[PDB]
Write a protein that binds this ligand. Structure first.
Ligand SMILES: CC(C)CCC[C@@H](C)[C@H]1CC[C@H]2[C@@H]3CC=C4C[C@@H](OC(=O)CCC(=O)O)CC[C@]4(C)[C@H]3CC[C@]12C
Ligand SMILES: CC(C)CCC[C@@H](C)[C@H]1CC[C@H]2[C@@H]3CC=C4C[C@@H](OC(=O)CCC(=O)O)CC[C@]4(C)[C@H]3CC[C@]12C
Ligand SMILES: CCCCCCCCCC(=O)N(CCO)C[C@@H](O)[C@@H](O)[C@@H](O)[C@@H](O)CO
Ligand SMILES: CCCCCCCCCC(=O)N(CCO)C[C@@H](O)[C@@H](O)[C@@H](O)[C@@H](O)CO
Ligand SMILES: Cc1cc(N2CCNCC2)nc2ccccc12
Ligand code: NA
Ligand code: NA
Length: 283
């Protein structure tokens, strides 16, 4: 009865989780393989896209599988170390994603307002340093505070969860919830929106239709990212002030909306003929 109902749900979620993993992994391997095998797609801007595919690949290979086992089985099967590692990797990927989008927006702004200054400043070696710096900074604000337990709360509910090896809820204190959100998400979001609007304005004051079509693609990956993660991070803050005003399962839904973003960019890149061709060829 209870057991048949469990077996039905377990089986069904496991397939659905498999699908989501497969979509995230296939899509982002395709983006990486496409850019890595097509001279025409080997632009500096696409180096930044590859970094973003790596973030999403890590979400499909490590973040989502582990979270799937949690949703499907109803406890954490892997112990407390792996629970902390997993949470770290989760925070890392979101931070790395939005910081990279931020860089992309700035890269385009420099390209569009000062194409010559850009041509000579911006090389492959620098693109590389930029990408490493973004991962450095993301690692710094993800791993270290989590491995220093700066996120832990005194509350008994929180304490219940920490001793329990089957609980891997990321139940944090309020200072971390606000700090972490601002540092990992809100600040880079405001930077990206500010620079993205300026790129819009400069594009309006301006082969042109083709360039703009690629800008619009970047604009779409930025907007869909915002739509997918903003709700989660708004709710994160709201909870700090009032635990009860937003229902818990919708806090979970918004988290999964966020994870689902990692499957979206490869689809969105099908707006481009060059990507579409390299995808067909590769498959
Ligand atoms: C488990 C967690 C900690 C995974 C962390 C992996 C990172 C170290 C990955 C994610 C994105 C990767 C980057 C994505 C893309 C590139 C472009 C790649 O090729 C080039 O930029 C041109 C170099 C050349 O022409 O040889 C150089 C490595 C680099 C920076 C990668 C270096 C390794 C990065 C930072
Ligand atoms: C490192 C750079 C990128 C960040 C620069 C921003 C900081 C100078 C300021 C801006 C907003 C400030 C935050 C605003 C609100 C809070 C909540 C505050 O204290 C509480 O939340 C008490 C609640 C409780 O524990 O009951 C903790 C510090 C923090 C994150 C502040 C820490 C310092 C912040 C991040
Ligand atoms: C990059 C984010 C860095 C976050 C820095 C948070 C440090 C402050 C942590 C702190 O104040 N507490 C947890 C320190 O263990 C204790 C209180 O929050 C307590 O009332 C619950
Ligand atoms: C999310 C859009 C994803 C659309 C992917 C379909 C490719 C064709 C779309 C296109 O070229 N325009 C729309 C213009
Ligand atoms: C920055 C940040 C991320 C985060 N994720 C864990 C759940 N999966 C989505 C990402 N959770 C946080 C919780 C508190 C503060 C900051 C967080
Ligand atoms: Na992402
Ligand atoms: Na625990």
């Amino acid at each position: 009865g209870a057991e048949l109902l469990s077996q039905q749900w377990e089986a069904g979620m496991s397939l659905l989780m498999a699908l989501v993993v497969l979509l995230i992994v296939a899509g982002n391997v395709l983006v990486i393989a496409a850019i890595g095998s097509t001279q025409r797609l080997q632009t500096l801007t696409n180096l930044f896209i590859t970094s973003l595919a790596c973030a999403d690949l890590v979400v499909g290979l490590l973040v989502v599988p582990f979270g799937a086992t949690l949703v499907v089985r109803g406890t954490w099967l892997w112990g407390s170390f792996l629970c902390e590692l997993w949470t770290s990797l989760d925070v890392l990927c979101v931070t790395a994603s939005i910081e990279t989008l931020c860089v992309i927006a700035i890269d385009r702004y420099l390209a569009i307002t000062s194409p010559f200054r850009y041509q000579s400043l911006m090389t492959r070696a620098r693109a590389k340093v930029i990408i490493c710096t973004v991962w450095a900074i993301s690692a710094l604000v993800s791993f270290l505070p989590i491995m220093m337990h700066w996120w832990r709360d005194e509350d008994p509910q929180a304490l219940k969860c920490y001793q329990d090896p089957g609980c891997c809820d990321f139940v944090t204190n309020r200072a971390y919830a606000i700090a972490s959100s601002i540092i990992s998400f809100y600040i880079p979001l405001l930077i990206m929106i500010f620079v993205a609007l300026r790129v819009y304005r400069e594009a309006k004051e301006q082969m042109l239709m083709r360039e703009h079509k690629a800008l619009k693609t970047l604009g779409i990956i930025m907007g869909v990212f915002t739509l997918c993660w903003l709700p989660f991070f708004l709710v994160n803050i709201v909870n700090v002030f009032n635990r009860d005003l937003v229902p818990d399962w919708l806090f979970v839904a918004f988290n999964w909306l966020g994870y689902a973003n990692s499957a979206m960019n490869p689809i969105i890149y099908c707006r481009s003929p060059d990507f579409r061709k390299a995808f067909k060829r590769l498959l």
